[PDB]
């Protein structure tokens, strides 16, 4: 007897490798026609993690009006370029794409997504389409009007500017982002006006907003039941190993049940994490990116020595409390929350007081090179 709960949840099954790496939005927010035309998703790249010290504004709490330290995750979010529009009909068999309209000129970044050997290829991806856009200017309008009258659901095609990131990959990430304004005609017009235009992170999300982060977790390879499902280690006396499950099944049913913990893949899985609060939407064009109202040092959002295995963030970034799935430099999907946030914790404004910029490459103790120089005085490499 001695009843105990299950080891693991039978909702994240199968425990297999994800069929994707970008991470896809499985459900866009419900469309409200009264709201202005806006996007429901964005793509960024995880740069790393750092500290945050802030004053709590939670009445009735022991830490009210007190200092609290929280871990935050930095996601570099350079502006995304809109290059296409997709219309979705509402057939009794689900949403069905009717047609796709693309921009006149597609950059090399987005065009590399369509190829597996870009340099060896002739790079003739959007050639006849570009010719049609240049010399017809009639079929594009016809397709846009078709999306206007049909296609109750409208999504734009946007690709990341991965060339502005310190990543070796030149292949940009392309994703369908839903537009959740109103007046499907206005949605199409907004997409047409934003063709070959860059949409910024601050125009999609705002301060203290609760969002969802979508991405593929870190790969871990095969793993035994002890670490894959959290099963109890067998005693030291156990013959033929102990990092297993003792009883895999009973007699009739004379089969191994799907609910029994087994060894196998334990990482690289698609996950959506709910209720991530935006602590700061920083711009890459100001030298006070990591400064606060209570700490006026002219420093940007990058630890000295650079982010570990990422580099230096030189574009717009979003700071999220807690952790997000996936390793560093992985592309992450930020999605607007599908729920309503009325709790005081969700609605509490966040005012950062200090941002850690010490090196994450060790036990760093200096926030700026100027502070390091002030503490260390002059060194042997500095005197001569």
């Amino acid at each position: 007897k001695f009843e105990q709960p299950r080891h693991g949840s039978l909702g994240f099954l199968p425990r297999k490798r994800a069929s994707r790496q970008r991470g896809k939005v499985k459900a866009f927010p419900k469309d409200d026609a009264s709201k202005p035309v806006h996007l429901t998703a964005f793509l960024g790249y995880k740069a790393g993690m750092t500290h945050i010290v802030r004053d709590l504004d939670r009445p009735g709490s022991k830490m009210h009006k007190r200092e609290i330290l929280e871990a935050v995750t930095v996601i570099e979010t350079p502006p995304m370029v809109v290059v296409g529009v997709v219309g979705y009909v509402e057939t009794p068999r689900g949403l069905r794409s009717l047609t796709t309209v693309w921009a006149e000129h597609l950059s090399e970044e987005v065009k590399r997504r369509f190829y597996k050997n870009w340099f060896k290829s002739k790079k003739k991806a959007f050639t006849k389409y570009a010719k049609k856009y240049a010399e017809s200017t009639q079929s594009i309008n016809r397709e846009l009007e078709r999306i206007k009258k049909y296609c109750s659901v409208v999504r734009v095609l946007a690709h990341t500017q991965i060339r502005k990131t310190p990543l070796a990959q030149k292949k940009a990430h392309l994703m369908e982002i839903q537009v959740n304004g109103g007046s499907v005609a206005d949605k199409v017009e907004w997409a047409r006006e934003h063709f070959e235009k860059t949409v910024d992170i601050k125009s999609t999300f705002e301060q203290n907003e609760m969002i969802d982060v979508i991405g593929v977790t870190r790969g871990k390879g095969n793993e035994g039941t002890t670490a894959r499902w959290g099963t109890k280690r067998l005693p030291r006396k156990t013959h033929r190993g102990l990092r297993k499950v003792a009883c895999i099944g009973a007699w009739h049913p004379a089969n191994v049940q799907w609910t029994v913990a087994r060894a196998g893949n334990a990482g690289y899985m698609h996950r959506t994490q709910l209720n991530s609060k935006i602590y700061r939407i920083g711009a890459g064009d100001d030298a006070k990116n990591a400064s606060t109202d209570f700490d006026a040092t002219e420093k940007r959002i990058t630890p000295m020595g650079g982010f570990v295995r990422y580099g230096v963030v030189e574009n717009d970034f979003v700071m999220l409390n807690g952790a997000t799935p996936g390793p560093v430099k992985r592309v992450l999907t930020l999605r607007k929350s599908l729920l309503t946030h009325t709790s005081r914790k969700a609605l509490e404004p966040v005012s950062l007081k200090w941002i850690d910029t010490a090196s994450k490459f060790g036990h760093g103790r200096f926030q700026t090179p100027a502070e390091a120089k002030q503490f260390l005085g002059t060194l042997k490499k500095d005197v001569a």
């Binding site: 500290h51 010290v53 200092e67 330290l69 209570f294 700490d295 007081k353 200090w354 850690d356 010490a358 036990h363 103790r365 200096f366 926030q367 503490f375 005085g377």
Partner: protein
């Protein structure tokens, strides 16, 4: 929002750095890292090690 000073290494300690040890004689010690904490537990003097600010001040390093 105050930056403290390590009890052993004498370096600046920002929030979330090192640990705090309260001895039996109501004395509070702040260690900036495990190296300083372990060395204090090993009963090393901060005035002996060359990399401590106390040693540099007592040996007029810097003038």
């Amino acid at each position: 929002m105050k930056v403290e000073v390590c009890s052993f290494s004498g370096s600046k300690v920002y929030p979330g750095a090192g640990r705090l040890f309260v001895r039996g004689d109501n004395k509070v010690f702040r260690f900036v890292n495990k190296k300083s904490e372990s060395l204090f537990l090993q009963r090393k003097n901060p005035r002996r090690l060359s990399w401590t600010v106390l040693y540099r001040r007592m040996h007029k390093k810097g003038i």
